[PDB]
Amino acid sequence: XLGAT
């Protein structure tokens, strides 16, 4: 989650 999480 490259920032996605």
PDB file of all heavy atoms in Angstrom:
ATOM      1  N   UNK A   1       0.862  -1.216   0.000  1.00  0.00           N
ATOM      2  CA  UNK A   1       0.000   0.000   0.000  1.00  0.00           C
ATOM      3  C   UNK A   1       0.882   1.244   0.000  1.00  0.00           C
ATOM      4  O   UNK A   1       0.926   1.980   0.984  1.00  0.00           O
ATOM      5  CB  UNK A   1      -0.904  -0.019  -1.241  1.00  0.00           C
ATOM      6  N   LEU A   2       1.568   1.479  -1.115  1.00  0.00           N
ATOM      7  CA  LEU A   2       2.429   2.651  -1.240  1.00  0.00           C
ATOM      8  C   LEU A   2       1.589   3.905  -1.027  1.00  0.00           C
ATOM      9  O   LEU A   2       1.317   4.650  -1.968  1.00  0.00           O
ATOM     10  CB  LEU A   2       3.069   2.688  -2.629  1.00  0.00           C
ATOM     11  CG  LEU A   2       4.414   1.960  -2.587  1.00  0.00           C
ATOM     12  CD1 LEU A   2       4.792   1.503  -3.997  1.00  0.00           C
ATOM     13  CD2 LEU A   2       5.490   2.909  -2.054  1.00  0.00           C
ATOM     14  N   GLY A   3       1.137   4.100   0.208  1.00  0.00           N
ATOM     15  CA  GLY A   3       0.279   5.226   0.531  1.00  0.00           C
ATOM     16  C   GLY A   3      -1.173   4.795   0.332  1.00  0.00           C
ATOM     17  O   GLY A   3      -2.089   5.384   0.904  1.00  0.00           O
ATOM     18  N   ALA A   4      -1.376   3.744  -0.485  1.00  0.00           N
ATOM     19  CA  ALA A   4      -2.720   3.237  -0.742  1.00  0.00           C
ATOM     20  C   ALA A   4      -3.413   2.772   0.547  1.00  0.00           C
ATOM     21  O   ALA A   4      -4.628   2.918   0.681  1.00  0.00           O
ATOM     22  CB  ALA A   4      -2.656   2.086  -1.753  1.00  0.00           C
ATOM     23  N   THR A   5      -2.653   2.218   1.496  1.00  0.00           N
ATOM     24  CA  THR A   5      -3.240   1.754   2.748  1.00  0.00           C
ATOM     25  C   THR A   5      -3.406   2.916   3.723  1.00  0.00           C
ATOM     26  O   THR A   5      -2.551   3.786   3.728  1.00  0.00           O
ATOM     27  CB  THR A   5      -2.349   0.682   3.378  1.00  0.00           C
ATOM     28  OG1 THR A   5      -0.988   0.971   3.092  1.00  0.00           O
ATOM     29  CG2 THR A   5      -2.713  -0.689   2.805  1.00  0.00           C
TER      30      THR A   5
END
